[PDB]
Design a protein around this ligand. Structure first.
Ligand SMILES: OC[C@H]1O[C@@H](O[C@H]2[C@H](O)[C@@H](O)[C@H](O[C@H]3[C@H](O)[C@@H](O)[C@H](O[C@H]4[C@H](O)[C@@H](O)[C@H](O[C@H]5[C@H](O)[C@@H](O)[C@H](O[C@H]6[C@H](O)[C@@H](O)[C@H](O)O[C@@H]6CO)O[C@@H]5CO)O[C@@H]4CO)O[C@@H]3CO)O[C@@H]2CO)[C@H](O)[C@@H](O)[C@@H]1O
Ligand SMILES: OC[C@H]1O[C@@H](O[C@H]2[C@H](O)[C@@H](O)[C@H](O)O[C@@H]2CO)[C@H](O)[C@@H](O)[C@@H]1O
Ligand SMILES: *[C@@H]1O[C@H](CO)[C@@H](O)[C@H](O)[C@H]1NC(C)=O
Ligand SMILES: [Co+2]
Ligand SMILES: [Co+2]
Length: 434
């Protein structure tokens, strides 16, 4: 897709800190950009939409190539249309924003410049951030994660994509998403099937795959940490159901691991660690700090801080495994206890290390789940399972929770605030910010 300028594109600024082993942190200045799917897509020569509701213009978009040549992405009114605002080192995303139309959440990427994404090399380093999830009830997900996206949004690889990172193009994740309107410089109109429950979405013939590191997927009820390996580390197109993931009939028939080696304290047995109120170790009605460390062995460590008290990731006992570190033994024990084999089939942490060794783009999003109602995160899943089934219970939410139309109507004012992002070598982010 090309870029049009009927509406100006001004990326909201966002500062963060880069720390060093020497014990000092320095301020960096970046900005955020909204994903291309949220934008107005219209003809390059007029204001006629190329996409409207959940269908494509059959004349402007008869096929993937022609559509890309005829259509462009336009600017976004961040605050008024998408409920996205920033202030210093803080970013807030509103759940439902009402303007000309109704908008639900957002997916944003951290930029290095106005035209490029900021790339982070996680291996050997640690990432820290403060988060307020108090306004996120059952069914919602305020996420912060990394994906192996190209710094330019794919422009250098795909000439027909001239909009680039400035317009939030190039997304990919372990689900090999097929809902993306533009992939590899082309539209995703061929094989397009409109969603039955979402008036704005559909599923196309192609998907976009890549490694994904889910640092944080959570609400006030549950939280999970999950690495997802893929046989191909970076962004790669996929065909139909061979994509696997949430958008295909076969979830595990692809090149990426859509499940990952997840670590949810509640799912692991500690139902008193994270939740709303003082009866939990970490009170989700208050802001907290989340620190994730990527050691060179490929293992991942985690600790939290609230009101100046530090808590390491709670110990878990699963099969022959015991400890609080996400390593090869944990992931193997999890597959043995909870079942499944996609993580190991995709290479596990060894394959995943290839992603963290390279650059990864930071993503912050707020969304509700039109496919599984977020039950996999905060309820019992599958819903027909009982508490006696290992790993079925992931949270205290009712199995009837998370219906999009319902949560959007009942909790429109929900929101998430991410702030004070700090990145640097292991053991450095806890030091004084510059
Ligand atoms: O027409 C002439 C006038 O145009 C005006 O401009 C309009 C334009 O016409 C109109 O088309 C445009 O409409 C856009 C809406 O403003 C916008 O809200 C809407 O956003 C949708 C988006 O369509 C949809 O693809 C997206 O799907 C989400 C999904 O909800 C979410 O559950 C899922 O979540 C993932 C997470 O993000 C991720 O972190 C996690 O790992 O996985 C999750 C599961 O996959 O993500 C998908 C996206 O991949 O939802 C959003 C939000 O509801 O998009 C509309 C276009 O399709 O609005 C323009 C502005 O009003 C001009 O302004 C006027 O001057 C002209 O005259
Ligand atoms: O695709 C949504 C969500 O899936 C998560 O994997 C789930 C999977 O959906 C479920 O079938 C299985 O039983 O449990 C796993 C772990 O909760 C995945 O970890 C998320 O990253 C992803 O957003
Ligand atoms: C849950 O984790 C917290 C923090 O590590 C710990 O104090 C508490 O004893 C754990 N509770 C259970 C039931 O394991
Ligand atoms: Co094809
Ligand atoms: Co270790």
């Amino acid at each position: 897709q090309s870029a049009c300028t009927l509406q100006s594109e001004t990326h909201p600024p966002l500062t963060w800190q880069k720390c060093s082993s020497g014990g000092t942190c320095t301020q960096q200045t970046g900005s955020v950009v909204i994903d291309a799917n949220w934008r107005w897509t219209h003809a390059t020569n007029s204001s006629t939409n190329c996409y409207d509701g959940n269908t494509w213009s059959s004349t402007l978009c008869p096929d993937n190539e022609t559509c890309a040549k005829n259509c462009c992405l336009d600017g976004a009114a961040y605050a008024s249309t998408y409920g996205v605002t920033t202030s210093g080192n803080s970013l807030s995303i509103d759940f439902v924003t009402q303007s000309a139309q109704k908008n639900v959440g957002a997916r944003l990427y951290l930029m290095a410049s106005d035209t490029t994404y900021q790339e982070f090399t996680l291996l050997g380093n640690e990432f820290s951030f403060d988060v307020d999830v108090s306004q996120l009830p059952c069914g919602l997900n305020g996420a912060l994660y990394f994906v192996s996206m190209d710094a330019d949004g794919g422009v250098s690889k795909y000439p027909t994509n001239t909009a680039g990172a400035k317009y939030g193009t190039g997304y990919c994740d372990s689900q090999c998403p097929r809902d993306l309107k533009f992939i590899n410089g082309q539209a995703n109109v061929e094989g397009w099937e409109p969603s039955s429950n979402n008036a704005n979405t559909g599923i196309g013939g192609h998907g976009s795959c890549c490694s994904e590191m889910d640092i944080w997927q959570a609400n006030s009820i549950s939280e999970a940490l999950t690495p997802h390996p893929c046989t191909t580390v970076g962004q790669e197109i996929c065909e139909g159901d061979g994509c696997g993931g949430t958008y295909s009939d076969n979830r595990y028939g692809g090149t990426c691991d859509p499940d990952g080696c997840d670590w949810n304290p509640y799912r692991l047995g500690n139902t008193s660690f994270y939740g709303p109120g003082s009866s939990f170790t970490l009170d989700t009605t208050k802001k907290l700090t989340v620190v994730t460390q990527f050691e060179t062995s490929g293992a991942i460590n985690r600790y939290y801080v609230q009101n100046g008290v530090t808590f390491q990731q709670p110990n878990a006992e699963l099969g022959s495994y015991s400890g609080n570190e996400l390593n090869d033994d944990y992931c193997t024990a999890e597959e043995a206890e909870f079942g499944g084999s996609s993580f190991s089939d995709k290479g596990g942490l060894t394959q995943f290390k290839k992603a963290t060794s390279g650059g990864m783009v930071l993503v912050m999003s707020l969304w509700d789940d039109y496919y599984a109602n977020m039950l996999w995160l905060d309820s019992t899943y599958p819903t027909n399972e009982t508490s006696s089934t290992p790993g079925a219970v992931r949270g205290s939410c009712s199995t009837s929770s998370g219906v999009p139309a319902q949560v959007e109507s009942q909790s429109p004012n929900a929101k998430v605030t991410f702030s004070n992002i700090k990145f640097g070598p292991i053991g450095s982010t806890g030091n004084p910010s510059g």
